[PDB]
Structure formats: structure tokens, C-alpha cells
Amino acid sequence: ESKCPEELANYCDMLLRKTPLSKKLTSEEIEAKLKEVLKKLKYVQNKDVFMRYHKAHLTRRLILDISADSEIEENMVEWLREVGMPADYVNKLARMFQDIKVSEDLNQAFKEMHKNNALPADSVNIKILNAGAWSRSSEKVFVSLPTELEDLIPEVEEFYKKNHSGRKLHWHHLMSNGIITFKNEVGQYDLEVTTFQLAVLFAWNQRPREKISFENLKLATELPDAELRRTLWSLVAFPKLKRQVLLYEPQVNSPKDFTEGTLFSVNQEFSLIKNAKVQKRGKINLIGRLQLTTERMREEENEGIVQLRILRTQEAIIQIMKMRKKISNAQLQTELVEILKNMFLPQKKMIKEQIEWLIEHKYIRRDESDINTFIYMA
Amino acid sequence: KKRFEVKKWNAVALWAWDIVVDNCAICRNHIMDLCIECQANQASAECTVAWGVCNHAFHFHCISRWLKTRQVCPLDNREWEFQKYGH
Ligand SMILES: [Zn+2]
Ligand SMILES: [Zn+2]
Ligand SMILES: [Zn+2]
Numbered sequence: 225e226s227k228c229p230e231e232l233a234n235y236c237d238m239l240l241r242k243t244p245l246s247k248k249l250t251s252e253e254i255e256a257k258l259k260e261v262l263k264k265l266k267y268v269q270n271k272d273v274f275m276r277y278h279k280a281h282l283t284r285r286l287i288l289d290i291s292a293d294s295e296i297e298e299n300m301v302e303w304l305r306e307v308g309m310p311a312d313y314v315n316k317l318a319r320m321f322q323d324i325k326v327s328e329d330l331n332q333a334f335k336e337m338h339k340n341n342a343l344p345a346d347s348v349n350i351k352i353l354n355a356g357a358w359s360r361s362s363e364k365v366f367v368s369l370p371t372e373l374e375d376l377i378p379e380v381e382e383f384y385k386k387n388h389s390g391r392k393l394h395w396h397h398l399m400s401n402g403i404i405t406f407k408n409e410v411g412q413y414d415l416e417v418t419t420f421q422l423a424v425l426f427a428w429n430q431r432p433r434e435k436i437s438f439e440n441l442k443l444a445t446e447l448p449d450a451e452l453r454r455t456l457w458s459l460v461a462f463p464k465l466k467r468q469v470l471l472y473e474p475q476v477n478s479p480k481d482f483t484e485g486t487l488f489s490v491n492q493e494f495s496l497i498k499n500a501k502v503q504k505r506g507k508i509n510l511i512g513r514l515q516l517t518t519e520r521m522r523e524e525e526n527e528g529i530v531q532l533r534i535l536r537t538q539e540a541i542i543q544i545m546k547m548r549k550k551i552s553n554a555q556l557q558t559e560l561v562e563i564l565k566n567m568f569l570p571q572k573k574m575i576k577e578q579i580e581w582l583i584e585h586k587y588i589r590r591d592e593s594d595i596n597t598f599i600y601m602a
Numbered sequence: 603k604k605r606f607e608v609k610k611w612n613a614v615a616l617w618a619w620d621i622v623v624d625n626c627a628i629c630r631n632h633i634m635d636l637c638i639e640c641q642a643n644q645a646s647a648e649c650t651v652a653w654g655v656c657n658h659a660f661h662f663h664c665i666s667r668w669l670k671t672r673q674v675c676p677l678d679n680r681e682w683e684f685q686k687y688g689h
Pocket of ligand 3: 626627628629630631637638660661662664
């Protein structure tokens with residue numbers, strides 16, 4: 225069912241993203257299901273919501289290489305063009321695939337151009353996309369990278385200049401991840417980690433059996449408290465796992481309870497348990513939901529939907545006004561609902577707020593003898 | 603020969619136009635601050651940002667006024683197209 229546009233965007237993501245559900249379905253199953261959602265779109269008033277969350281999900285999926293089917297993923301752009309989405313929305317969507325294609329060519333051009341040397345050449349991938357279209361947050365999450373990865377920054381940077389001048393790269397480490405080798409005392413494993421997790425774990429490299437406090441990790445990592453808290457939590461409390469990679473001091477049930485003095489240490493007995501028997505070797509993905517949507521990002525997305533609404537309502541009202549020079553509130557509301565028809569449905573409260581804003585800004589004015597009827601002026 | 607070692611890495615960078623995170627180009631106040639019209643006529647009855655598919659960014663109020671003379675980007679000269687209004 226899912227009437228709510230956002231539930232519908234999440235659902236779509238659950239099908240286009242590598243997920244337990246995405247795995248339990250064939251192309252055809254997925255495909256048909258993606259269409260039985262777009263169909264239900266013609267009954268959604270606030271279409272701008274689905275469009276914005278769908279695009280936000282698509283962004284993570286392409287930036288993180290987590291599409292279940294490059295095919296289905298791309299064919300979705302036409303499926304949207306069919307159900308009637310605007311050519312402008314659909315077109316910027318198609319623009320994102322182009323951007324990725326352009327990014328992957330630039331990836332190789334780098335991998336070969338640089339067979340000469342920090343790391344085994346090919347083991348390093350890069351993705352460089354335009355900010356205006358791939359950035360969704362104005363917030364920047366900083367992280368001090370371990371030398372073993374910082375020596376790459378200047379490499380990738382020079383390569384980009386002689387290719388494109390007058391440009392500047394902004395590292396989006398929150399969206400960076402990789403694989404590392406954890407050499408225990410029971411074995412050695414390959415952990416699919418988040419770059420922030422990486423930075424955190426590498427803090428013990430010249431002090432393997434040392435305990436480090438939260439505060440000191442914050443100094444060595446330079447992560448903002450919020451991020452550091454959840455990153456650390458994913459390492460001392462990865463769900464369902466029987467043995468955590470990291471151990472901490474006063475026990476808690478929430479990363480909120482960590483304090484300056486909480487001590488962390490590398491568990492020298494970490495191991496994967498395949499067949500109830502310790503495994504001296506193996507591979508695990510500890511990224512979890514660390515690179516997926518957060519509550520904060522949601523408030524950000526909604527603020528964006530609200531910004532565009534207000535702007536689009538102001539333009540629509542003036543426009544209707546720049547046509548009739550005098551109109552009744554009743555009449556304004558209804559032919560205004562029509563122009564915003566394919567985006568959302570403004571509520572009376574917002575309209576009054578805008579109209580109100582328009583009066584004090586001298587674009588319109590109420591009638592001399594009528595608290596309603598508005599008169600265009602200027 | 604340590605406990606944690608990098609086997610593989612996927613870095614990500616989002617590009618913008620070099621100069622400096624400096625002010626509006628059409629107008630000239632900091633892209634994050636008020637614009638010629640707001641910071642001056644904020645004496646009575648919100649200068650935000652807008653992007654172009656060309657990845658150039660200005661105050662929405664400055665690039666809107668300019669687009670009326672010609673629908674192209676002030677910096678390069680390609681057909682203009684709003685990419686994003688979100689901050
Ligand atoms: Zn302004
Ligand atoms: Zn431009
Ligand atoms: Zn400006």
C-alpha cells in the first residue's frame with residue numbers, strides 16, 4: 225500500500241539497493257515490483273517528496289556501488305519518464321549515470337597512468353563527481369587519515385589538475401570505504417570497513433595492546449563526536465557477531481553513554497566462527513548501516529522540500545497575479561493548486577503565509593473593501 | 603608488519619570550481635552571506651544558494667536577475683540550468 229511518498233522512495237531503494245530483499249528476487253520480480261510502485265505515484269499529492277528521496281537514495285547507491293542491477297537501475301529512468309515525471313527531474317537523473325561513466329573512465333586513466341609508485345596500484349579506486357549534483361549536505365565531516373592513505377591524496381590531486389584546470393576536490397570520506405587486514409593473535413582477517421572505521425582502528429598500529437580513551441581517539445581521529453560515537457559502537461558492538469574486533473571499558477547499551485574516560489582496546493582474540501569452530505582466516509563486512517541515511521540527513525531533505533515549496537508557491541502566486549490583476553482568495557487557491565499539480569499540494573496555512581509575505585513585500589495588496597480579493601501591484 | 607593494514611581502498615571526492623569558497627560572482631557578497639539586495643534592504647519587510655548543471659554556484663537572487671538578460675551562466679557561457687536550490 226504505502227500511501228506516504230517517502231515510504232515509497234525507501235521501498236524503491238530497498239529493491240534497487242543490494243539488500244536481503246534485492247537478493248530474494250529475479251530481475252523480472254524486481255522490475256514488475258518497481259512498476260507497481262510508480263503506478264501508485266499518480267495518486268500521491270506530494271510527488272516532490274518521492275522525487276527527492278528517490279534521488280537521494282540513488283545517489284548513495286551509485287556513490288557506494290550498491291546497485292543490485294546496473295540494468296534495472298538505469299531502466300528506472302525511463303520507467304519514470306513514462307509515469308509522467310518531469311523531463312527535468314528525469315533528465316538530471318540520467319545525468320548522474322553519465323557522471324558515473326565519466327568517473328570510471330577517469331578511474332582507470334588513473335590506475336594505469338599510475339602503475340609506478342603507498343599501495344598495490346589496482347587496489348585503489350577513485351570516484352570524482354560534481355558537488356552540485358552529488359552533494360546533499362552542507363555539513364562536512366572531517367577525518368584525519370592515517371599516513372598510509374594520506375600519501376594518496378596528493379597523488380590523486382595532481383592527476384586531476386592536468387586533466388581539468390580551475391577545479392578543487394573536496395574529500396567526502398564519509399562515503400569512502402575499503403578492505404583492511406587485521407592481524408590478530410588467532411589469525412588474520414579481511415575486514416570490509418568504512419574509512420572512519422579505518423581511521424579509528426589504525427590508531428592502535430604503533431601500540432597494538434594499548435588501551436586508548438574516547439577523548440584520545442577523538443584527538444587521533446579528529447572525527448566529530450557524533451560520528452566517532454557510532455563508528456566506535458560498530459566496532460565494539462557489531463550486532464549478532466559473537467566476537468567484537470574492539471573492546472571497551474565501562475560497558476553501556478548506547479554510544480550515548482560513552483564518556484571521555486571510556487577505554488578501548490584491540491581484542492587480541494578476535495576471530496570469525498564458521499562451524500562453531502574458531503577460524504584462523506576469513507572475511508567480514510563491518511560497514512553495516514554506517515553509510516546509509518541518518519535522521520539528520522532526513523531533516524536536511526525535508527528542509528529542502530520546504531525551501532522549494534515556498535519558492536514554487538511564491539512564483540505560482542505572482543504568475544497567476546501577473547495574469548488576473550484582481551482575484552478572490554477562493555479562486556487563487558484553486559488555480560494555484562493546478563499549477564503545482566505535479567509537484568505537491570500547498571495547504572491553506574502555507575498559502576496564507578506566502579500571500580501574507582507577498583503583501584508586506586509589496587507585490588500584492590488586499591482589496592479596499594474585502595478582506596479577501598487580492599490586487600496585483602507592481 | 604603491523605596489526606592493521608590497507609589491502610584495498612575506495613576514495614571519493616566531489617569537485618567544485620577552484621578559486622576559493624568565495625562570494626557570489628554576479629553580485630559579490632560571500633556565497634554563505636546575504637546578497638546585494640538582502641544585506642542592504644533588510645531594513646523592513648532569504649538570500650540562499652542555487653547551483654547550475656555546470657557546477658557553478660551563486661545566490662539564487664543574483665543569478666535569477668541575470669538570467670533575464672540571457673539564460674546562460676555568467677562564468678562560462680553554456681545554456682543555464684538549475685541543478686539544485688538546496689543549500
Ligand atoms: Zn537576496
Ligand atoms: Zn557555469
Ligand atoms: Zn550572490
